């Protein structure tokens, strides 16, 4: 079917210069190469944050400590205030 | 990974996670001040316990 065959061959061929052989695109005056594989190759990381979100920041946990390892001047005040709270108990 | 046919970073971020697969060790740091807290605890507790065990029969 020369209807079918010639329509389908032009259907394959006129984008075959756009996809198979990298001859840019004869009918399009803007180019096709510096849009998706060059400019928006950083597209999703122009859609997300670069260098913290996509590099993902393997970050060390900020180390919190115990109560500064001082169990004298605070525990005896706790025991005196506990005398006070038991006088309230 | 094979969902993204345009992979290009999944090896990068995968080896980034496997790089930081030893994330950070935990904090079992207290073994000196915490034993002092329970030392005061056992101190005042046995004070109370001996006093009430005396004063009950008293």
């Amino acid at each position: 079917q020369d209807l079918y065959l010639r329509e389908l061959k032009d259907t394959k061929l006129a984008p075959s210069t756009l996809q198979d052989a990298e001859g840019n695109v004869k009918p399009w005056n803007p180019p096709q190469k510096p849009n998706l594989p060059e400019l928006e190759l950083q597209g999703p990381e122009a859609l997300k944050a670069y260098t913290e979100q996509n590099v993902e920041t393997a970050h060390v946990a900020k180390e919190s400590e115990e109560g500064e390892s001082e169990p004298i001047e605070e525990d005896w005040l706790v025991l005196d205030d506990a005398e006070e709270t038991k006088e309230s108990h | 990974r094979s969902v993204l046919k345009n992979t290009s970073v999944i090896d990068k971020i995968e080896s980034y996670v496997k790089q930081y697969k030893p994330v950070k060790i935990d904090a079992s740091k207290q073994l000196q001040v915490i034993e002092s807290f329970e030392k005061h605890a056992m101190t005042n507790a046995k004070e109370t316990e001996s006093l009430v065990s005396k004063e009950l029969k008293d």
Side-chain angles (χ1 to χ4, degrees):
Chain A
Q1 185 180 2
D2 292 330
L3 183 150
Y4 174 76
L5 268 74
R6 297 284 78 77
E7 286 165 354
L8 265 292
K9 286 301 291 182
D10 285 331
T11 303
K12 182 66 176 177
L13 184 62
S16 295
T17 184
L18 278 76
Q19 182 173 358
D20 183 75
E22 280 326 303
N24 228 172
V25 50
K26 185 180 263 77
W28 296 349
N29 290 318
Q32 189 178 2
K33 288 180 181 180
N35 207 166
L36 300 172
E38 181 175 359
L39 179 61
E40 298 288 321
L41 193 276
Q42 293 85 18
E45 62 185 0
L47 188 145
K48 300 295 182 183
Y50 62 95
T51 201
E52 289 90 6
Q53 185 183 0
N54 294 304
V55 172
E56 297 170 349
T57 56
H59 191 272
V60 62
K62 179 65 178 177
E63 181 65 33
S64 297
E65 293 179 354
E66 188 61 30
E68 286 89 11
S69 69
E70 198 275 325
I72 299 197
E73 292 182 354
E74 295 178 353
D75 285 331
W76 290 102
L77 290 182
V78 161
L79 191 62
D80 293 331
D81 293 330
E83 280 290 328
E84 293 178 353
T85 58
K86 190 175 172 66
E87 288 182 353
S88 76
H89 293 303
Chain B
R1 175 178 62 83
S2 179
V3 172
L4 181 60
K5 193 257 184 66
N6 293 318
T7 299
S8 176
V9 289
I10 310 174
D11 196 2
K12 182 259 181 183
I13 64 170
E14 179 68 28
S15 179
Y16 188 80
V17 172
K18 297 294 183 182
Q19 182 61 255
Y20 197 68
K21 180 172 71 176
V23 176
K24 183 178 180 291
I25 46 94
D26 54 354
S28 179
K29 183 257 289 182
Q30 47 168 355
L31 56 92
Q32 295 177 356
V33 62
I34 182 168
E35 67 181 1
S36 179
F37 295 124
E38 60 88 20
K39 181 179 88 274
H40 290 287
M42 187 270 288
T43 300
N44 298 314
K46 294 294 176 67
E47 287 173 352
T48 295
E49 182 178 1
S50 179
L51 185 60
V52 300
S53 65
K54 180 180 183 294
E55 292 295 326
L56 179 62
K57 294 181 181 180
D58 178 74

